[model samples]
Target: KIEEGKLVIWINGDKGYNGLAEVGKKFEKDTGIKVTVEHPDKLEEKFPQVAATGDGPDIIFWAHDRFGGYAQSGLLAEITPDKAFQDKLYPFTWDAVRYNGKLIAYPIAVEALSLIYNKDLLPNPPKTWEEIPALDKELKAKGKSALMFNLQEPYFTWPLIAADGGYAFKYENGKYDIKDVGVDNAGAKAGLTFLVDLIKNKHMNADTDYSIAEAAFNKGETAMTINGPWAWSNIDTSKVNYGVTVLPTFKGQPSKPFVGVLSAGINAASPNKELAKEFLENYLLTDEGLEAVNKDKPLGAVALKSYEEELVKDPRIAATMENAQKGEIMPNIPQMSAFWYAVRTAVINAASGRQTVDEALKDAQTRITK
Candidate 1:
């Protein structure tokens, strides 16, 4: 019975787990239920095997991106929050955890990238890509790079494509239209053209990967970089005076980053399903519960709408929310697996000038559809 029992939860050993541990303790205090939080090595890799053997925890905390595969494989329990409960969460966050129109998880946080600039270099952030050139010239005169980011990584590169209307798949009618691939469309070409110009002109280079960009930014070698909340952990605020804001626009269109949600999912085979549901509804969804979880770790914007006003008071959280307000939710369909790996190669090849933009993107579309 839920009145007095033990429940287990599996989480990655990160901020998410630390936050949940705080909430789990409170849950135990209120319900006489002991919550054991486990940090299994490579939780994503171990989960499928553990769940299949009916040895999975009653609940699992992880990113919403994997919920699609688990739900389809009958590993996740179908959880339909009532209208009252659903109304509290960000609509996009709620949608992110849904698979086949069924809510499979409870979203707790929202994440998206923003343009993080050194306040000392640029008092105000550039509003559009046009301003980047002037800033680059100024930074060059000062013997520092204008901007640096992971040019070879698709996660950082795709925002440019999105600014020009490119998308991995056309999402419509509550489903991902995998057949309608737009990776190599006109908009995508325009975005890639702009990116290639930057590389060719020596504003940035193909060799700047995530680690390089991050280190340079931290050392104040670059004026600005595109990164998300997770980057905050590596940054030393004492050494770098930074300000976060929405990314610059392209051709009068806002650059849209992908929003990823962190959520909790129940195991279908869990014997404590009823108690799990009760804990989720009564404790995890409450304001006090969310506060406890967010106390130790407040990286992304809180998924709860009511908590947004308070969270946004922090400039960093506000910046992430600004971008996410217009951001596209990452596709959670199982087909997205193929899209990610395929796009990374295409982006790397195109940026490195190893292949022409047209040749690279065309190859990507071909791989995605196949």
Candidate 2:
């Protein structure tokens, strides 16, 4: 039950256990309002289910992209960016949460992927995907580690394919047009093949799991990787000198980094819509709340640059914000959930030689068509 003194919220942790506790405590102190937080185990339970039942808490802190799918399925509430609140943000940020012509979430923070390289070894991020092979060869010649991307991890692979001019699905004239699901494209075939080939070539530390990649980067066993900005804190910078750059372009086009944002929305059925909007307005959308959010989270802020003074001086923050300028919002389509699973299956099949690139994508297309 919500205490008379504070607002109530239910949330799952992202950075760690009870992550939002700190934010809630601060919010209460700052506003003279209490924010009670509750967490149940399996903490990674998806928020849409909670939202679907309308039994969810007043606010949920989760990935902005996931909210898009929820909004599409009538599981999420429409949240228009209060012009007074949103007109002040960076354009990309505003668009990231605005789904299907409805701005349903207020972005709290964002992370755009980039080529993270160990400067002691790589010295620089590869400018294009074509350069990865040669760089791998060079690293081998020096007997030093080289590039490693998660071949079995489609979460990473989706953005990589996007950089190569491939997309999971296409949008047309205000509707999601399925005319070109690129899993079968020639370019997708090449990208997936390259990932598998890299594993077989031993250029990378060979495990597609997140833990494996984190450990490799942390230990300096791998020199470079395509990853999101969230890894900055975990990387031991002193031991492995590193630098950042945009993801490599594929086929001469800029590689699109999938933009992940954090935003808030009102539950349409919320016994609390007015209160939700008021809460988001006074807290999440304000300069003070945003600054606090970015400081603790260490991702790019959607708040105006003028409001980001504290963040500007932090190099990791600066690097991430700079990287965000070149990213493309990962679409929050309802079918995105399905798209993700199918794409991963296709990539693994192509990578493992179970199917040719064309064959894998063709199967994916057929599935999506159904």
Candidate 3:
């Protein structure tokens, strides 16, 4: 056991590394263990190569979605928290970091989609998808769009699929069934068809990409939009008085968006495995560490139940937690790469009227299986 030795951490530059690094300083100060943090742009791609050579960092930080590959390759150390620790986190947070019934990582926070409305324009948020049309008509009368979102983005569009009884894969018995891919299932087709009709009706358009959608929301050209907490950074709260809440129900069921978790895992090949475990479980998982990470920028619903209560003091965090509790955790299987590309193409094709909903979905399913 490499006790009291330096523990190196490799994290993606974009995944709140600044905050984590700040926390790392305190960990080093308190435990007298040397801590080094590095941000690598290509951490995900280079990790396996270095890990195999036994030259990787003691810890790797990334989104939970990529854990399956590392776990399946035996590159991650299983670090199970005690029952007390487990009870302190949101149930699905643990689910997000699990692989083959083993805890592969420590979950930090949770994210999901919600409706963000301009309080000055939309006094009340819509509770059902059916209400959007009427809201659109009212907004048009005032020279504005009722809603704005990237219709071509699969992440934003997947809620419609779930609303229609469709899922990426069946999450049963604590695992995903690859054979149960649902991109072309009856429910997905119906959901995609609904999206197509909305485009045709001019509620949204094929040209409204992320830049345009956010620009519109920022300029108050749209009263309401579907987005996640990540959008908070770019938004100037001084310019727009906005409120976030759960997505509207479809038919009668709530729209279940995909909830993703940001997590940290230990490198299985690390010489300082025990040190890494202690640093992660004791120092990083504490209230002080979490607070340090979330102080300037509260990402979303944090994993620890008490820490989450502190975070939700901000209305945005409250809305994010509310929506996350009602959403499906994103699957982390390798099949997800094909799934993303296929659904993105399918949604864009159908939304742009370049292909029929059935045609687009059929093509997606075929691509996913191949």
Candidate 4:
């Protein structure tokens, strides 16, 4: 309330500010309620202290993972969209902005891994793991690899194992069960075994890392890779015809990658809570505002389906949204830091031959609890 009656928002990046400012102009002219959009330096570190001091913006914009901390601390207000409004958004976005079963933010941007293939090499991408070995054999003769990615990296490879039931924490009764870690379960073990067997048979290279995969894909030495919208930056897609699609299934079970969302939340203590929600619900999330934002920033994948037609014009963005719809949002709990490290260690140990998959998963599970 103290920014001289302006509704203030804290968001990162010049693109965000530029886009939102354009949207805000119309909002201000329509309602006479001023809008201020800017990102603070040291936001992740300073915002906690800033909010507690009662100097926070009316709205906060950031990755959904950080919203849990603010909501748990009573710094965020629950945002309930009517059923009709909720239906307008992609469902995966809702999963990210929730804290303890209550909606806390509005998703604007989304990212997740999808299958990227060279259209020249794979006119039709395989639909299941059973088709991979033949492609590996056939592609190798042409001096290309069938599939490549950061194979030992959990972030890049988890979906291959997760399709079977692997998860960092159990999602039960509408929330995460932190006490139950499922990475070492039967389904995950089966999935890991399949992936390792592929490596064992030379279908995938054991030493593949992000740089290696990026380089191979750029050179067209690899026919397929797993990536997100960021792949456009890492890979020179202009060099070859490429397509992005949902990851193929194993048997009949579909693989799921992790979804990351950038979302907006209202400050719990704001005097402008009602006005903020009005702007967010009636204006910011509308097609006009999203269009202005995308015009300036070019959202890789949007959470609102009003842009599906616009997104489909770019096949990579279209498939990213499709895959994101199938993926699980990364957990927002602080424990996630430890979980990431533990899983990385587990994947690395097993893939590098230091331990069997069972042993690696077992050790990581134990390590996480500590």
Task: Answer with 2 or 4, whichever has the higher lDDT.
Answer: 4
lDDT tens digits, residues 258-363, model 2?
5677566555546655555666666655666555554444455444545656566666556556656655566666666666667767777776678776777778
Off by over 4 Å in 2: 1-20, 30-45, 140-144, 172-174, 236-239, 268-275, 301-305, 308-327, 368-370
Candidate 4 lDDT at 278 equals 80
Instruction: Look at candidate 1 and tell me the lDDT of residue 313.
Output: 92
Report the C-alpha lDDT of model 3 over 1-370, residue by residue, as the tens digit.
2223888888765345566777778778887777787887668667777777767878887768777777887888897788888898877889899888899988878878888888888999899877887888889899988889877668788887777776787879877877777889987887788778778898878778777888888889998888877666555543887888888887677787877787788888877778887877777677877777665345578888887887789888878877776778889776765776788899999998898999999888877665
Better model by TM-score: candidate 2 vs candidate 3: 3
Regions more than 4 Å wrong, model 1: 1-16, 27-63, 80-82, 233-239, 269-284, 292-297
- Clashes in each model (backbone N, CA, C under 3 Å)? 0, 5, 0, 0
> What is the lDDT of every predicted structure here?
0.78, 0.63, 0.79, 0.76
Better-scoring candidate (TM-score), 1 or 4: 1
Candidates 3 and 4 compared: the better one by TM-score is 3
| Top-scoring candidate (lDDT) | 3
What TM-score does each of the candidates earn? 0.83, 0.82, 0.83, 0.71
Which residue pairs show collisions in model 3? none
| lDDT of prediction 3 | 0.79
Worst lDDT window (10 residues) for model 2? 11-20
